[PDB]
Amino acid sequence: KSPEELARYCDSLLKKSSKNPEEAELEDTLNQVMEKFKKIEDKDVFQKFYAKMLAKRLVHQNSASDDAEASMISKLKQACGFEYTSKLQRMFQDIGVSKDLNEQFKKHLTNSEPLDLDFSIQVLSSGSWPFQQSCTFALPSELERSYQRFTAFYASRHSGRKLTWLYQLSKGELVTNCFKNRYTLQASTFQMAILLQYNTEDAYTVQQLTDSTQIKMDILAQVLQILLKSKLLVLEDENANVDEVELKPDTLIKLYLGYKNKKLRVNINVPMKTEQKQEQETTHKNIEEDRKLLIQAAIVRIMKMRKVLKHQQLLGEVLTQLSSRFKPRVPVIKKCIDILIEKEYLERVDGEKDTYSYLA
């Protein structure tokens, strides 16, 4: 948790929750953070956490200062080579090509087709960004025009590419007509989808939404529990436990027409509580697998070098080389070697017992 909390801390400093941080002094505190970092065992854990963290900032423009961000990437590269800050820099360059890409799509649209909404998209290279597939989401009709219209646009852009939409990261803005006032809702794309459903009926059960938005209930439940937090939607009982009362596939959902709020633009797109856990668990699995890759890499750097070596000598070299990034577990390197043979990168010398040789 220590190397993780340090990264979370960095987020704190380079994240803007609207309050401007004195520039110069943060440079000192970044350079301070960098010293408590060089004294970290599992560097690689900090890396995964600080990337996934730099990820959320870039995608949502939530970055305190353009300058500070790259300031930390020159320190980190100087303190762990260009492997450590490879994917990082690619994410910056990616956001920039995206910026450029978007405009290039507006123009093509400016001259040809109409748009019913204000569309804005961030294409990111499927490798560098620590994100994952959505959850089998059924696309609302109004958005769909902007979907197909872009997917088709992109087909022209490139020869063999493919787009993978990450709806669990997409947001947007709804405008309300069915309430006392005129509100501008800032809602996640999951939200938008269930809200547009109440453009015909005014109540469905938990089972009817899962059938019309294809949202896996697991994630549909956590979302509705946010749509009940804001008094936008309500159930038959206006007294139930707002936090503890789990829903059922048969519990109804009602569009509360008595919606009142002391402000015109609201933010209902809040981080749900099961998120800071679930995303942590997944990042841990990605780290565990990342280490396995680092290791295979070592095994190959080493075997490639000394064309033949005994198991025990191999293990010792691998530990030597990785010791600076983390504290490898023996059973793992065993497994990495094994996999490497199934992959035909190295084989066992017949006659010899535990002597391996690299397959040129």
Partner: protein, 81 residues
């Protein structure tokens, strides 16, 4: 009962598109029989799926699993579902 869309900010991942509609282990169409069953001529040759979403004839991925353990197409161990 009326909501409207003013803005939508999307996020997407671009990758190269690899059309693999064969079995990686015996090399012929998933939707037809595996190499070993065409050796036997004349329903019980199904396709097994992994948590990794990769698919191979159940027959191949068995013989293959005899000597190896990490999915023919990724770095993770093979897991049914």
């Amino acid at each position: 009962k009326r909501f409207e869309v003013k803005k939508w900010n999307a996020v997407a991942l671009w990758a190269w598109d690899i059309v693999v509609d064969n079995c990686a282990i015996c090399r012929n169409h998933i939707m037809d029989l595996c190499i070993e069953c065409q050796a036997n001529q004349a329903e019980e040759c199904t396709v097994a799926w992994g948590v990794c979403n990769h698919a191979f004839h159940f027959h191949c991925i068995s013989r293959w699993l005899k000597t190896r353990q990490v999915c023919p197409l990724d770095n993770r161990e093979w897991e049914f579902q």
